[model samples]
Target: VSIDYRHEMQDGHKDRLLISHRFANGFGLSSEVKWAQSVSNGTEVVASYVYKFNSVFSIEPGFSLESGSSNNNYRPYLRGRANVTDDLSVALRYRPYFKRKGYTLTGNIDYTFLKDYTIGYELEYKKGTSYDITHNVKLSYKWDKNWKPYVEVGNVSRQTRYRVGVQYSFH
Candidate 1:
């Protein structure tokens, strides 16, 4: 489970909650819900499968039911992660829109240092009537085996935003 506080320069604040469970197999189920103070509420439910092709590379493919502002949409996505070096990693997520003609892509590059701290850079691109892009950076700490806390600040689709969150995982 995780909780996040998100603030957008133009849309006010939002609080988000997310939870997920991974089975012994490669299947997982997850859901996220968000409430915005000045915008619409939304929820996303996803069923995904994770596969590791090697010690350094893995992939997850998922489908989602996205509900927002009374409109429902479907999202099918694939994400790939790679451990490029002992302290460096990268991830790419590809999402194809069911209600539109284009896709969205996001990439993350991270470097781990000081044993339990990581710094990351992220970029997201979307295609619609026109093209949109966002760049973000985050710093996080791994508190323990089951706890992680992070702060991210950046721009999204031309809007400036920041997020603070913590994630807890348990078996």
Candidate 2:
């Protein structure tokens, strides 16, 4: 279980908050409500679930909405995950808003070879007037319960855009 918040000096002048909890029966519930740019402009709210049967595979549905200004939009998605082994897994997600601009499909695969290291690749396809596809690989190492560093490298339209960050968690 965890609760998180982001506030101040962020340019948005808005605070983002989320709460999540996991149960022993393999069921989890989480919701996030975040403002866009500013508190008055609008906010995007998302809520999701985790429903796993035994171990191998699971399906979860999620819903999101944006409200404020001249925008009133909602989106629905289904997330599917499969575990090939204890250290290897794959995930697929479908986001079907399909409102003239087409839809979105994303896939990711992960494998953990070292004790606390994970390597994963993610691909995203958004179909509109034409189709756009992007791919990236992310690597993360957990140095302990308190420290983790992660990096992601990806290409967009043959241009390079990569992100790297480290985190310390306390709740």
Candidate 3:
């Protein structure tokens, strides 16, 4: 979670920005705008562009410039995949925390032996400032084009959880 603001140079002006990057292959940067509220009163006007590479592989590097708590930060991340067969694959990701100066590694294996049915097993490890290792397993079934119900379980992250979600497709 990172945020920035630019407007103090000239009185009575404000603009805000926010950037969030996950250890996985996803990231979002957004901005807003505000008016007449104080030096802190500003809207996040714009956001950083996000690029998602092929589901097989992804790489992203980012930088920022601001002030106060908004100091510049840098990050380089990667996500890759290897196909084992038509019904199985392995995925991995690595993210380095520059601000906290640490590293996190995540890996998972996905198998879909039955039509519309899939199972995933994942492991994550972090070291540097904090140390912990976690494992997770998820089973999902697709009943239709738009609905999927899943059950996941693991460490404290999720002892046992069930989720029903919908996905829309143009084709």
Q: What is the C-alpha lDDT of each candidate?
A: 0.83, 0.71, 0.53
Give candidate 2 regions above 4 Å deviation: 1-43, 67-73, 98-101, 167-171
Quote the positional error of residue 102 for candidate 1 in Å. 2.8
lDDT of 1 at 89: 93
lDDT tens digits, residue span 1-171, model 1: 443334334326777788888786889998888778646788889999989898799999999988878566788999999999989999999997766257889999999999999999999898953378989999999998888888888887657787888877673
Q: List pairs with backbone clashes in candidate 1.
A: none
Tens digits of lDDT, candidate 2, 1-171: 555554422202445555566666655565656554533455556667768876999887887776656455676889999999999999999986633145679999999977899999999997764377888888888877766677777775576655555545444
Which candidate order results from sorting by TM-score in descending order?
1, 2, 3
TM-score for all models, in order of appearance? 0.85, 0.71, 0.51
lDDT order, best first, reads 1, 2, 3
Q: How close is candidate 1 to the true structure, as a TM-score?
A: 0.85
lDDT of 3 by residue, 74-131 (tens): 4355566776677888877786656516777989899995799999998988776647
Clashes of 3: 7
Off by over 4 Å in 1: 1-11
